[PDB]
Amino acid sequence: WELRCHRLQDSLFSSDSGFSNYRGILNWCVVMLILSNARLFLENLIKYGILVDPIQVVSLFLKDPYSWPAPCLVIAANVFAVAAFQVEKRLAVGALTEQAGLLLHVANLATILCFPAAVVLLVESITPVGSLLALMAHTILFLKLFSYRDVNSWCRRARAKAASAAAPHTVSYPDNLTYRDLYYFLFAPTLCYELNFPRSPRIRKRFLLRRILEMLFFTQLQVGLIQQWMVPTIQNSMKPFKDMDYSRIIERLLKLAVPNHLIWLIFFYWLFHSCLNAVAELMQFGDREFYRDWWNSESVTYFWQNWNIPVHKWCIRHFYKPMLRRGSSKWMARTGVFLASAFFHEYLVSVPLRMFRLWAFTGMMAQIPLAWFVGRFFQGNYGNAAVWLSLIIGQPIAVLMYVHDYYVLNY
């Protein structure tokens, strides 16, 4: 008799094998990055490890509040973060009938956006990477206060209706309107409010240390990137894109499309994993699903929903499902989310740098002519390559243009 030892199978790397267990290409990345930067990092963590006075700068800011206006705006955000809580406590019981409460919420939410978009423009002494750290706070606060309105209104209407008729600290409606949990919400790494968030058992000092080291390593890595690889390429030709021709633009962009993409990947891993896990660890949060696998995204429409899960499940719950419930024309809703995304794009990248060329708008617009294209022609492990190319020459380029035209006009 014969019992065969050769089955009929496929190589693990092959397209039609369906293996998908490459956790270890990832550790190769980590090991190589560490072997290549684990002396420059140990030297920079010394030369900047005692020469940053992390306690004297707060006293120098206390020495003058009107200088350094960026932390001034960040602390000023509490005015809105408290006015909204005050509206909630007002209509929590008997005051401020839903009409007035809703109009007050709309006014407060509008001023959260319109106040820094005015301060950072008029006030001159503000820095671009310091203006961004006020706008990326006054949009997160706006997105959080939107849902803080919505969840409470929904639960309050539910209690109003239940007025027409537990032990495991599951906080009911009115008992969640304390300052402590509002603040815990604001710092929590999520944009969708919810009574009695999940919690994690402990703090896990090890995990927090590893995440802090990831942040301190990746910021140093991409500073190395910006200084060595991308500033020389720019100042070899300090001609700003605002006047160059659509033929020289591309010639000069191909020399930056790769380093740009690399610093964007490093931004993602530094921000959406390491920083948000440090936050969600200190304040025991436990959810920690900030991104799905956007990398193996066979089509771009699937990539748009899996990086930055917080924003996407905020959309799908407070912008999409509400405006399909009491509405229709779902394509109009997809358009609405595209327009809101374009507004926040052109508000976060164009306001701090005071440019309004509306390049990022063309970048967001040219995604649909690319989305339908990739979803129509490519499939599988070539649709994934189409998405990976779109992430190189697509949207991040439309921010590289702004930062290039700014660095050129000033150095």
Place this chain on the structure above:
Amino acid sequence: WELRCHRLQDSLFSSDSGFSNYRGILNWCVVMLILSNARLFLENLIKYGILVDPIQVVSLFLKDPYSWPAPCLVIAANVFAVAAFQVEKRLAVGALTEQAGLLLHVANLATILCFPAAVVLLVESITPVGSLLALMAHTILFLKLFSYRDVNSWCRRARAKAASAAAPHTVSYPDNLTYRDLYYFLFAPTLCYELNFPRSPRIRKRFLLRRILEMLFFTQLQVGLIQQWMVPTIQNSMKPFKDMDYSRIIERLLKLAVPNHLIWLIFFYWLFHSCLNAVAELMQFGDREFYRDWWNSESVTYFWQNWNIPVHKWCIRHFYKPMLRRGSSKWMARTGVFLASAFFHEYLVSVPLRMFRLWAFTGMMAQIPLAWFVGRFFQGNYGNAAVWLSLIIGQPIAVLMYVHDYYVLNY
């Protein structure tokens, strides 16, 4: 009522999430390699696409057989590949009682190894990368003829015993001793013989073309590697390792440990996937399991069994299980496989370069002091980093030493 939207989960990159679906970090590798070399490759495929006369070189070899001794040896291998088949056909029916047949097989298998190990040493006009392409053929032929002996002997004893008492072309014992299937075995990408191999339906011109392009791209890539990154680093200090001190050796090795590892990874993907899939495609083979996931190998003992599956399932069937069945002391068998692996190492890397420093033997020996260490201390996504480090500063270094000491002594 409240139905929560925040579960209690972990980030996909985190150690304790168990995601393992990173097919798309891999396509990122492919896309980046292609964007970075997809002009140099299109230029080199032209400058060498018509200036290689792929039909005149066979006529120049026919013009003189004693010059170019490497293809002479490769074609001479058929003497043994036919003597073994003749022994099989002899004792297939009535001649050559098992004693004589076994002794003839032992003699032929010994001369397969001892003949080129003598020709390439004495004959002077032979080149190192041309001597390697005769030794890596006379060991594959030896390993194949071993199992060609064993399978046939086992089936023949089975027929002898069945003498003490179908339709789907399942070839029985004696009808598999034709020249056609012996040759099909020799070129088949496997080292373990088996009557009626699996088969694939068609040839799939697309797949064959993609594999050929992978070969032509990766060889060009690693020639770029050897020329740009590693030859300058060597000829900045042309002092051969044979006399340098154990303190300067390491100082000079750290400048090559990464490029070496990169060309070894490229060797793996060029050889164990692309070339073997091209072969297994032309001759419709269908098995195509030439490697398991050796990358996510949490311990080195698991890496030793999952790269190069052909050799491992040859060991486990013709060297390991036979010598545990009629034997014992399994640790002695693990030692035996280590010793055979060391012999083929020091036979394939040391004979073509005529060096016998027995460095690769220390490299193979220092794996067990490393194997037990990694398996004892590290676990999980840090054991995988231990394995990835062992693959950088471990065995491949012990071949880089040979090739360095050879390139230095000659250029």
